[PDB]
mmCIF file of all heavy atoms in Angstrom:
data_model
loop_
_atom_site.group_PDB
_atom_site.id
_atom_site.type_symbol
_atom_site.label_atom_id
_atom_site.label_comp_id
_atom_site.label_asym_id
_atom_site.label_seq_id
_atom_site.Cartn_x
_atom_site.Cartn_y
_atom_site.Cartn_z
ATOM 1 N N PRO A 202 57.336 95.616 221.350
ATOM 2 C CA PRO A 202 57.795 96.425 222.492
ATOM 3 C C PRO A 202 58.109 97.884 222.137
ATOM 4 O O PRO A 202 57.957 98.782 222.992
ATOM 5 C CB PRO A 202 59.058 95.691 222.949
ATOM 6 C CG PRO A 202 58.887 94.276 222.429
ATOM 7 C CD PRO A 202 58.195 94.439 221.119
ATOM 8 N N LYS A 203 58.525 98.136 220.902
ATOM 9 C CA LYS A 203 58.881 99.493 220.489
ATOM 10 C C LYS A 203 57.692 100.447 220.486
ATOM 11 O O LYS A 203 57.878 101.653 220.630
ATOM 12 C CB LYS A 203 59.507 99.518 219.101
ATOM 13 C CG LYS A 203 60.858 98.813 219.017
ATOM 14 C CD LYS A 203 61.442 98.952 217.622
ATOM 15 C CE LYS A 203 62.783 98.242 217.483
ATOM 16 N NZ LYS A 203 62.660 96.792 217.576
ATOM 17 N N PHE A 204 56.482 99.931 220.296
ATOM 18 C CA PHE A 204 55.325 100.815 220.144
ATOM 19 C C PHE A 204 54.997 101.597 221.430
ATOM 20 O O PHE A 204 54.909 102.823 221.393
ATOM 21 C CB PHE A 204 54.116 100.066 219.585
ATOM 22 C CG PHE A 204 54.353 99.507 218.196
ATOM 23 C CD1 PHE A 204 54.233 98.153 217.944
ATOM 24 C CD2 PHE A 204 54.693 100.341 217.150
ATOM 25 C CE1 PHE A 204 54.436 97.652 216.652
ATOM 26 C CE2 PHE A 204 54.909 99.850 215.876
ATOM 27 C CZ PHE A 204 54.793 98.478 215.634
ATOM 28 N N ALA A 206 56.872 101.934 224.055
ATOM 29 C CA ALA A 206 58.084 102.645 224.474
ATOM 30 C C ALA A 206 58.290 103.950 223.709
ATOM 31 O O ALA A 206 58.716 104.971 224.277
ATOM 32 C CB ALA A 206 59.281 101.756 224.292
ATOM 33 N N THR A 207 58.015 103.921 222.413
ATOM 34 C CA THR A 207 58.180 105.091 221.569
ATOM 35 C C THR A 207 57.115 106.130 221.892
ATOM 36 O O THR A 207 57.403 107.311 221.913
ATOM 37 C CB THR A 207 58.186 104.709 220.096
ATOM 38 O OG1 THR A 207 59.246 103.750 219.903
ATOM 39 C CG2 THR A 207 58.445 105.918 219.228
ATOM 40 N N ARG A 241 66.121 108.899 218.993
ATOM 41 C CA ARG A 241 65.894 107.828 219.982
ATOM 42 C C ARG A 241 65.336 106.531 219.386
ATOM 43 O O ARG A 241 65.366 105.489 220.050
ATOM 44 C CB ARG A 241 64.937 108.288 221.082
ATOM 45 C CG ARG A 241 65.263 109.629 221.708
ATOM 46 C CD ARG A 241 66.132 109.514 222.913
ATOM 47 N NE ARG A 241 66.168 110.777 223.660
ATOM 48 C CZ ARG A 241 65.316 111.138 224.617
ATOM 49 N NH1 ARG A 241 64.315 110.346 224.991
ATOM 50 N NH2 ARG A 241 65.471 112.314 225.214
ATOM 51 N N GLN A 242 64.802 106.580 218.166
ATOM 52 C CA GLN A 242 64.179 105.397 217.574
ATOM 53 C C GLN A 242 64.413 105.363 216.076
ATOM 54 O O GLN A 242 63.758 106.049 215.299
ATOM 55 C CB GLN A 242 62.686 105.313 217.924
ATOM 56 C CG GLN A 242 61.957 104.074 217.365
ATOM 57 C CD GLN A 242 62.736 102.792 217.561
ATOM 58 O OE1 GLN A 242 63.237 102.224 216.600
ATOM 59 N NE2 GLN A 242 62.870 102.349 218.813
ATOM 60 N N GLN A 243 65.380 104.544 215.674
ATOM 61 C CA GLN A 243 65.808 104.511 214.293
ATOM 62 C C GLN A 243 64.743 103.945 213.339
ATOM 63 O O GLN A 243 64.826 104.157 212.133
ATOM 64 C CB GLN A 243 67.115 103.705 214.174
ATOM 65 C CG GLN A 243 67.937 104.018 212.919
ATOM 66 C CD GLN A 243 68.586 105.409 212.935
ATOM 67 O OE1 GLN A 243 69.009 105.913 211.894
ATOM 68 N NE2 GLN A 243 68.661 106.029 214.116
ATOM 69 N N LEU A 244 63.737 103.244 213.864
ATOM 70 C CA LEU A 244 62.672 102.687 212.999
ATOM 71 C C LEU A 244 61.612 103.733 212.594
ATOM 72 O O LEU A 244 60.754 103.448 211.763
ATOM 73 C CB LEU A 244 62.017 101.445 213.634
ATOM 74 C CG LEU A 244 62.320 100.044 213.060
ATOM 75 C CD1 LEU A 244 63.362 100.007 211.956
ATOM 76 C CD2 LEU A 244 62.692 99.101 214.175
HETATM 77 O O1 PDC B 306 61.687 96.603 224.901
HETATM 78 C C1 PDC B 306 62.563 96.754 224.023
HETATM 79 O O2 PDC B 306 63.359 95.827 223.739
HETATM 80 C C2 PDC B 306 62.686 98.071 223.303
HETATM 81 C C3 PDC B 306 61.985 99.210 223.697
HETATM 82 C C4 PDC B 306 62.148 100.399 222.985
HETATM 83 C C5 PDC B 306 63.007 100.442 221.900
HETATM 84 C C6 PDC B 306 63.694 99.283 221.543
HETATM 85 C C7 PDC B 306 64.630 99.259 220.379
HETATM 86 O O3 PDC B 306 64.746 100.277 219.660
HETATM 87 O O4 PDC B 306 65.263 98.197 220.151
HETATM 88 N N1 PDC B 306 63.515 98.145 222.246
#
Side-chain angles (χ1 to χ4, degrees):
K203 294 183 181 67
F204 298 122
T207 303
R241 311 268 193 88
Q242 181 45 250
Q243 202 70 197
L244 253 5

